[PDB]
Design a protein around this ligand. Structure first.
Ligand SMILES: CC(=O)Nc1nnc(S(N)(=O)=O)s1
Ligand SMILES: [Hg+2]
Ligand SMILES: [Zn+2]
Length: 256
């Protein structure tokens, strides 16, 4: 199936997922001069004080940190959203080099990595149902630049050796996502899709303006993961990003 390789990479996803060449596809380039400052855009409201991280697993495309979304424990509201969205997981997209890795670009500028905190709209009941609606999901995007280490990310980094290959999982309790947020909650928002197959057009994208800095050694640790399953030839988990897609009409609004 699908991957990020020369033979199963993003350029091929359309054959199995036609919606690949759809109308509200993601990621896109954020043209800062074209973005529309919308003064009706309310400030974001991140209520992650009561979060319950459960596990960490390598799905073969990336690593996901799962959360308990059986109650309004970690939710997202305000900004451009209507209703409450519950955190289900977070994952990253990163490159083989420090000059590539993010999915979204800024004025064509590519970052080291990109953090995606995924939330689903509760009025829909379950995540499965949420992916059936135009306003099903809300993804908070955070850019990572290489510089000073991110204390709040070390917990994550130090467990990666336990989930090296595809299918491996590990208990990952008492992780506080708050440690991954920048100081400013200023953002750009637009209507898009999931950036990996089934590529469903259910996402309200929220990309933060201010990047977070992580050290070389932290990002390096990401790059040691394997796409492959245990007992197979090693294929380093690098460049797990999708190229920016055509905006196609859509307007990118700014909260600033
Ligand atoms: C279950 C779930 O949400 N999976 C996702 N996979 N990619 C996502 S992304 N990068 O488009 O936020 S969400
Ligand atoms: Hg949808
Ligand atoms: Zn993602």
């Amino acid at each position: 199936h699908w991957g990020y390789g020369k033979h199963n990479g993003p350029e091929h996803w359309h054959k199995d997922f036609p919606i690949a060449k759809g109308e509200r596809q993601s990621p896109v380039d954020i043209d800062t001069h074209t973005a529309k400052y919308d003064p009706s855009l309310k400030p974001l409201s991140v209520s992650y004080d009561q979060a319950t991280s459960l596990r960490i697993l390598n799905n073969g495309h990336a690593f996901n940190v799962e959360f308990d979304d059986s109650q309004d424990k970690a939710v997202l509201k305000g900004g451009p959203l209507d209703g409450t969205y519950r955190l289900i997981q977070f994952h990253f997209h990163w490159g083989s080099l420090d000059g590539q890795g993010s999915e979204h670009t800024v004025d064509k500028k590519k970052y080291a990595a990109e953090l995606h905190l995924v939330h689903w709209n509760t009025k829909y009941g379950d995540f499965g149902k949420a992916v059936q609606q135009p306003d099903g999901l809300a993804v908070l995007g955070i850019f990572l630049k290489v510089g000073s280490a991110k204390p709040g990310l070390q917990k994550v980094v130090d467990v990666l050796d336990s989930i090296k290959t595809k299918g491996k999982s590990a208990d990952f309790t008492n992780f506080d996502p708050r440690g991954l947020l920048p100081e400013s909650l200023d953002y750009w928002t637009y209507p898009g899709s999931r950036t990996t197959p089934p590529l469903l057009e259910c996402v309200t994208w929220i990309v933060l303006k201010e990047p977070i800095s992580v050290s070389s050694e932290q990002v390096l640790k990401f790059r040691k993961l394997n796409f492959n399953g245990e007992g197979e030839p090693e294929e380093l988990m690098v460049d797990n990003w999708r190229p920016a897609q055509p905006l196609k009409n859509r307007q990118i609004k700014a909260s600033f």
